[PDB]
Design a protein around this nucleic acid. Structure first.
Ligand SMILES: [Zn+2]
Lengths: 29, 88, 117, 183, 188, 205, 21, 65, 71, 50, 74
RNA sequence: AAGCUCCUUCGACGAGUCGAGUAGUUUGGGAAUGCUGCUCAAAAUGGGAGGUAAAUUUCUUCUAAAGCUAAAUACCGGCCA
RNA sequence: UUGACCUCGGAUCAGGUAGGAGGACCCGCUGAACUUAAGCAUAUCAAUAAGCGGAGGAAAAGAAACCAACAGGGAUUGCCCUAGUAACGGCGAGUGAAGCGGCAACAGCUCAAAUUUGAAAGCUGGCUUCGGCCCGCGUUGUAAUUUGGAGAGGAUGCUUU
């Protein structure tokens, strides 16, 4: 109804994308 | 100069300095209620309701850039105050 | 006064007599198509604007709607019978109206208008 | 008469309704490609008055161009580069006009109206079949659109002496030494 | 230049030509100003200066010419920005009744009130008004002190140099009856 | 984890954004529509006044042509078309107006409820521009209207007018002036509380 | 050609005329 | 509005909706002074930088020889 | 220049363009003007014979003594 | 201040009982369709010609 | 060596490392041409080769680009 | 289908566009000559330009931000003469 | 469960289209320095050369948000004079128009803003026996009517095809 589950899924991929895009530095790691 | 017999000329339809179309005023009034107000007009509305008419004109000119534009915008928002009080 | 590269922009008019023949042949071509009609269009008499030239008259662009109606020539038929129409010029004085109305009646007296088909 | 109501609404771009719609739409365009086809004009009144019809052959492509300067200032407009880039992607179409839809602080968003000259609907219909003639190829590249006319200065008066009828052509005319036969 | 010498005055941007002359009154009422120094240009060539008392006071219209502003490198003088000046008036201002009205308006426009908190404490320049032709000549000088020979004052021009020819004086802020006409003004 | 397609992610993000953002009243009012019963009762009358299809119109034209080769009452039908319906509202000819709730550019219909109210025309918001489309044999109708019905349906239309203005217009008399949105779930509330506690000690500016 | 253009040419076509000297 | 909006929405605007305003050099210098560390310029570190400087010209002079 | 040299060197024939003209220079048909028009005279000379007027504008130069087609 | 104030209905609260347009109604709105007659006559010509 | 045979123009001007022709720029769609060398332009201009198709255009224009066969032909 | 005539009825005209501020460039042209970028951001007896000391900013003249159009004009290239 | 709509995709799907050359003339972008003069610098060469993009037989411009202050002119373009004038420049080197006027040529129009609403009256396909049929586009607007020196709607009477 309020989209709690849909939001949780969407934020999950956003964090994964940010972590993956930041981990290709090797100095960030 | 020379003396010639002047003539009376027909009115030009290109003249927009007559009674303007009643429908466009209706559309403007309706749309203004629907759309709402801009952030800078909200500041002017608060100033006019608080009684700071002088500050309202000065702020409006800074945003608009002309004394005439500031005067028309302050007059327009003054009417909204009068109508909103009447509506309430 | 040759501080720029004038040599690359120098126009010589060695085609002055050639262009005149070309212009004369173009005028003949219009007469070939519009065989009985004149190759020009009737134009009104107007006064020059400036006070330097206001004592002299010349030809205008086209006839005003008011002076075309006073002559007795319909608007939509005037460009068809060889009369130029200018919708931008105003009369502003009876002198300009009378001069061009009389010009139109003189044109109507000399006209030979053929049946449509 | 819905388009007259839309004209007034588009005049109040900072109003609560328009600001809200422009905020959400700006985010959506940013998630999409730089140049992508819009199935429908987002400002139907603005598209209509610029010459858009709902026929087969009329398309809208919207595009965002990075804003700012090169301290040098580009003599053409950001709207001119938007039209030129869309025309290159749709090389078979003819650019008709373009209009502003959104700005943002990093980009600037326009919607471009294009007409297909090889479509039967366009060719049979007057009022648009003039664009089918070959003298109208890549008008946006030559400055023949509305933005190009403004940039070139094609206006009448004493404030446009140097640039009307072509700036470069006027310079050549004023700097040509003419010698007649009988001097 | 005139705004710098006036600590009690403020600058204002371009004013609409199609508006009304008494719209200057509520404009000045907006900023709590009771004196208006109005610059009016025609054809981008001519200058007209108006001095007025904003609510109701008299208003005088001049034609300004022979303008020599600051930043022209032939003056060699300087003065404090906002310092209280000495106003040098001519004897003609005391006799002609219309020149007496202009004298009071000038004293209000260039007064620099005594206790103003934007002025400067020490006095070093004199603003002089002279009437030689049917015109008012405005000059600004620096009071330079020199030790006397066994201190005397020497003057050096520092500022704007312009000529004012009175066109009209009207009672009322920017209207009302005409109380003086030049009858000899030759328009550019 | 598993990666969703780009266009599926985009339209799902818009669904969450629609309920998270605080929407202005002129767009908030489009959230409130009529119930299942009122929609069915409206479409029952509206179906009896459906315009003739492309095939039916040709057959009627062929019938008259054949008769002449070898005097009618004014047709009554549902009016559709945004420019058409707006002119009917401005001229106070539309008895009842139904507006879709999902017009892709919302600015095309955002003024319609206010215009209907200003003229005194009863109006309702119907879930589905496609549902309105089937009524007029189109893919999509932004707005439909009824000007005049036949004598046998004059009483039916009048009852539906009262039903809408009682069942729908009174229910939104206070909510049409209010901002919509603000449906924060548990995850959103945790983010907001976390945001506050990150600024409780120091505020970098 | 456009229908409005055709109507104008239908009822106001170019005529044949002459001017006497 | 910022209160109840997801990170992917807000972080997108923070990147692309920063107002463009001029920065004075005095403001830039103060920030550099304010954020300067306490061990940025010890006597030792400045000494090596000058010593490293003199070597580079000394070596460059040799390539010239 | 290189194209012109190539054509002069080639064995292909030269495409001699006939002197065709966009606009005809003489009236044609079975009307009064076409049957009375003299190809060797000028516009004014032909109109003067016809008794008609050729130019309704102002005379821009000196005409022939017998000219009656220029007003 | 109120970040999200309600809209005070200062224009639509006043009912007006007249159409916005004073233009006269065309005759065609009161009579059978001229266009439909033209379409039918085209169909009649087709039927007669076969 | 530094340059090999170019396929588009036939000269030994194709750089072996850059893989770009120094004369015509073969990988690029357009042919290299510069206005500061008029001699270079006239060496490769139209008319310096065979002119297979464009030589046949003028005769077709002279006859109006007509289509068909002469009347009475076999 | 079309032109006109008359009138106790109507008559919709283009917005991140003008405009103000600022930077660069440009022009014989700081009423900024024009253009572009950035900040702000309009109007409806409206808007633009100009005339005018003439006593108030009266008067004159046009209608921007949509579009098409032959001819007189240029031509070291193309087909020829 | 089924079925619409929206949006986004696949296909060696049915039919099309663009690229390259040429570039004398034409429309834009970008863009110098040698040189000339002056204590210096701006200026000059030049809004040129080089570089990039885009057309045609011409291109471009074009039917006034114009010129004017007149007893007014009346889209655009070009020639002649205006004129080395106004105007801008240590009022250096210098730079440098335009209105009027004579002439060549002349041509005017299309939309958006309206409800056909007593009848989407409009159009792309592809199957044909070439008679005509269906698939769709489209009401978030395709026809007819109108384009502000106008116009609409009624009434009236001639005229026109
Ligand atoms: Zn090669």
């Amino acid at each position: 109804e309020d989209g709690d589950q849909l939001e949780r899924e969407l934020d999950a991929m956003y964090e994964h994308y940010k972590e993956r895009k930041a981990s290709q530095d090797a100095k960030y790691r | 100069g020379h003396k010639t017999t002047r003539r009376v000329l027909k009115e030009r339809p290109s003249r927009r300095k007559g009674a303007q179309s009643k429908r466009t005023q209706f559309v403007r009034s309706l749309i203004r209620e629907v759309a709402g107000l801009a952030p800078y007009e909200r500041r002017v509305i608060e100033l006019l309701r608080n009684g700071k008419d002088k500050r309202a004109r000065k702020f409006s000119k800074k945003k608009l850039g002309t004394f005439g534009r500031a005067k028309r915008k302050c007059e327009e928002l003054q009417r909204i105050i009068a109508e909103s009080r009447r509506a309430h | 006064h040759f501080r720029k590269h004038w040599q690359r922009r120098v126009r010589c008019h060695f085609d002055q007599p050639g262009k005149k023949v070309t212009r004369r042949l173009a005028r003949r071509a219009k007469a070939a198509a519009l065989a009985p009609r004149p190759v020009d269009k009737l134009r009104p008499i107007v006064r020059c604007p400036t006070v330097k030239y206001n004592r002299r008259t010349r030809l205008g662009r086209g006839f005003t709607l008011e002076e075309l109606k006073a002559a007795g020539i319909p608007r939509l038929l005037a460009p068809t019978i060889g009369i130029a129409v200018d919708h931008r010029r105003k009369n502003l004085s009876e002198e300009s109206l009378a001069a061009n109305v009389q010009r139109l009646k003189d044109y109507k007296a000399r006209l030979i208008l053929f049946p449509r088909k | 008469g819905a388009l007259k109501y839309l004209e007034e609404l588009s005049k109040k771009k900072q109003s609560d309704v328009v600001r809200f719609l422009l905020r959400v739409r700006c985010w959506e365009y940013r998630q999409l490609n730089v140049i992508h086809r819009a199935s429908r004009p987002s400002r139907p009144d603005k598209a209509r008055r610029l010459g858009y019809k709902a026929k087969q052959g009329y398309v809208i492509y919207r595009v965002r161009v990075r804003r700012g300067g090169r301290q040098l200032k580009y003599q053409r407009s950001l709207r001119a580069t938007a039209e030129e880039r869309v025309g290159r992607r749709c090389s078979n179409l003819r650019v008709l006009n373009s209009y502003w839809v959104n700005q943002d602080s990093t980009y600037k968003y326009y919607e471009v109206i294009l007409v297909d000259p090889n479509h039967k609907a366009i060719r049979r219909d007057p009022r648009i079949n003039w664009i089918c003639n070959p003298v109208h190829k890549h008008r946006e590249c030559r400055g023949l659109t509305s933005t190009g006319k403004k940039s070139r200065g094609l206006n009448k008066g004493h404030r446009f002496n140097k640039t009307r009828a072509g700036r470069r052509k006027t310079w050549k005319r004023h700097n040509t030494l003419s010698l007649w036969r009988y001097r | 230049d005139l705004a710098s010498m006036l600590p009690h005055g403020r600058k204002d941007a371009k004013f609409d030509t199609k508006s009304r002359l008494y719209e200057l009154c509520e404009l000045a009422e907006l900023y709590n100003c009771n004196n208006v120094l109005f610059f009016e240009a025609r054809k981008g060539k001519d200058l007209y200066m108006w001095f007025s008392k904003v609510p109701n006071g008299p208003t005088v219209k001049f034609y300004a010419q022979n303008l020599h502003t600051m930043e022209e490198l032939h003056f060699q003088g300087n003065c404090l920005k906002g310092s209280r000046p000495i106003l040098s008036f001519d004897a003609a201002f005391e006799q002609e009744p219309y020149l007496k009205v202009i004298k009071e308006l000038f004293l209000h426009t260039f007064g620099v009130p005594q206790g103003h908190k934007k002025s400067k404490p020490f006095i070093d320049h004199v603003l002089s008004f002279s009437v030689a032709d049917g015109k008012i000549w405005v000059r600004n000088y620096e009071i330079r002190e020199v030790e006397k020979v066994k201190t005397d004052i020497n003057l050096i021009e520092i500022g704007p140099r312009f000529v004012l020819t009175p066109i009209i004086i009207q009672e009322g802020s920017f209207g009302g009856p005409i109380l003086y006409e030049n009858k000899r003004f030759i328009s550019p | 984890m598993v990666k969703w397609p780009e266009y599926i992610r985009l339209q799902r993000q818009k669904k969450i954004l629609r309920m998270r953002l605080k929407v202005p009243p002129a767009i908030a009012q489009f959230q409130y529509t009529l119930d299942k019963n009122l929609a069915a009762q409206a479409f029952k009358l509206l179906n009896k006044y459906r315009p003739e299809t492309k095939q039916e119109k040709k057959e009627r034209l062929l019938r008259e042509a054949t008769a002449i080769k070898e005097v009618s009452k004014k047709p009554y039908t549902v009016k559709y078309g945004l420019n058409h319906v707006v002119g009917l509202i401005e001229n106070k000819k539309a008895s009842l107006v139904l507006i879709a709730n999902d017009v892709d550019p919302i600015e095309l219909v955002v003024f319609l409820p206010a215009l209907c109210r200003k003229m005194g025309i009863p109006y309702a918001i119907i879930k589905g521009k496609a549902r309105l489309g089937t009524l007029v044999h189109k893919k999509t109708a932004a707005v439909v209207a009824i000007t005049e019905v036949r004598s046998e349906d004059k009483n039916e239309l009048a009852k539906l007018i009262s039903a809408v203005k009682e069942g729908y217009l009174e229910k939104v008399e206070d909510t049409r002036k209010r901002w919509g949105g603000g449906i924060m779930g548990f995850k959103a509330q945790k983010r907001e509380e976390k945001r506050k506690k990150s600024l409780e000690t120091a505020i970098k500016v | 050609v456009l229908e409005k253009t055709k109507k104008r040419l239908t009822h106001f076509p170019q005529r044949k005329y002459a001017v006497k000297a | 509005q910022k209160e109840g909006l997801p990170d992917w929405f807000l972080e997108d605007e923070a990147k692309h909706d920063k107002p463009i305003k001029p920065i004075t050099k005095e403001a830039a210098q103060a920030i550099k002074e304010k954020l300067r560390a306490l061990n940025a310029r010890p006597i030792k570190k400045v000494a090596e930088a000058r010593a490293r400087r003199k070597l580079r010209q000394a070596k460059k002079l040799e390539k010239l020889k | 220049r290189e194209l012109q040299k190539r054509k002069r060197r080639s064995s292909r024939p030269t495409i001699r363009m006939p002197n065709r003209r966009k606009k005809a220079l003489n009236p044609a048909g079975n009307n009064i003007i076409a049957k009375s028009w003299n190809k060797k005279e000028t516009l004014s000379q032909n109109y003067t014979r016809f008794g008609l007027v050729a130019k309704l504008g102002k005379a821009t130069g000196g005409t022939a003594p017998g000219n009656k087609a220029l007003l | 201040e109120d970040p999200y104030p309600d809209t005070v209905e200062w224009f639509t609260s006043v009912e007006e009982k007249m159409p916005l347009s004073a233009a006269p109604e065309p005759k065609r709105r009161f009579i059978p369709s001229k266009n439909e007659a033209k379409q039918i006559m085209k169909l009649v010509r087709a039927i007669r010609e076969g | 060596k530094t340059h090999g045979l170019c396929r588009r123009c036939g000269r030994r001007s194709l750089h072996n490392q850059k893989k770009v022709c120094a004369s015509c720029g073969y990988p690029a769609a357009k042919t290299r041409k510069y206005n500061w060398s008029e001699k270079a332009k006239r060496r490769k201009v139209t008319g310096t080769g065979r002119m297979r198709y464009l030589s046949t255009v003028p005769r077709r224009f002279k006859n109006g680009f007509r289509t068909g066969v002469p009347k009475g032909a076999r």
